[PDB]
Amino acid sequence: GSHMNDVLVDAYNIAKDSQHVHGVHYIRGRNVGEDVHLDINIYVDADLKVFESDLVADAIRRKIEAEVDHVRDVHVGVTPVRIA
Amino acid sequence: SHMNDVLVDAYNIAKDSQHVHGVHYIRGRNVGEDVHLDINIYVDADLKVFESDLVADAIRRKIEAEVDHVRDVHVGVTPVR
Ligand SMILES: [Mg+2]
């Protein structure tokens, strides 16, 4: 039936403990038929380079797509934060 | 942090409410210790405006009553024919 709960938990848990993630900013799940479309946005250090943040988002995407059932069209966005 | 609990509990409250056809989407945002929650439910297009309003409101009340760590809960509706 609904797979949202599993998708959101498993995806969040992947994102929150990936490298360079200071914390999850937001997560959004939308049901479309049997699929869940997922948008996650992660906080990263404002001083990270673009190439590095691009790799992080892509890794998180790859891992969610590999391990989380019922997911479609996963998007991982990044928000800079100043780290004291 | 508390996101996982907030999303699951709130989704479950919404989905099991009478007059909800299904959950359309759910969004959690972390702001410090708080989670801000937006949830959107599918309802029958023929519900009256007053009725859809009562459903959304009841969901909001229940989530605010039962789900720790939530702030600024918004329940929106999407009509379905
Ligand atoms: Mg896959």
Swiss-Prot record, chain B:
Effect seen on changing D38A: Isolated CTD does not bind metal
Q: Domain note for this entry?
A: The C-terminal domain (CTD) forms a V-shaped, dimeric metallo-chaperone-like fold and binds 1 metal cation (probably Fe in vivo, structure determined with Zn(2+)) per subunit. The CTD is probably responsible for hetero- and homodimerization.
Stated name of the protein: Magnetosome protein MamB
Indicate which residues the UniProt annotation says bind Zn(2+). Answer: H36, D38, H74
**Per its UniProt entry, which superkingdom is the organism in?**
Bacteria
Full-protein residues shown: 213 to 290 of 293
Q: Which organism is it from?
A: Magnetospira sp. (strain QH-2)
Instruction: Name the coiled-coil region(s).
Output: none
Q: What else is known?
A: This bacteria has on average 16 oval magnetosomes of about 81 X 58 nm which contain membrane-bound crystals of magnetite (Fe(3)O(4)).
Q: Give the quaternary structure.
A: The isolated C-terminal domain (approximately 213-293) forms homodimers. Forms heterodimers with MamM.
Topology Cytoplasmic: residue spans: 4-81
Q: Where is this region: C-terminal domain (CTD)?
A: 6-81
Protein task: Plays a dual, essential role in magnetosome formation; required for magnetosome vesicle formation as well as biomineralization. Probably binds and transports iron. Requires heterodimerization with MamM for stability.
Which family is annotated?
Belongs to the cation diffusion facilitator (CDF) transporter (TC 2.A.4) family.
Disulfide partners = none
Where located?
Answer: Magnetosome membrane
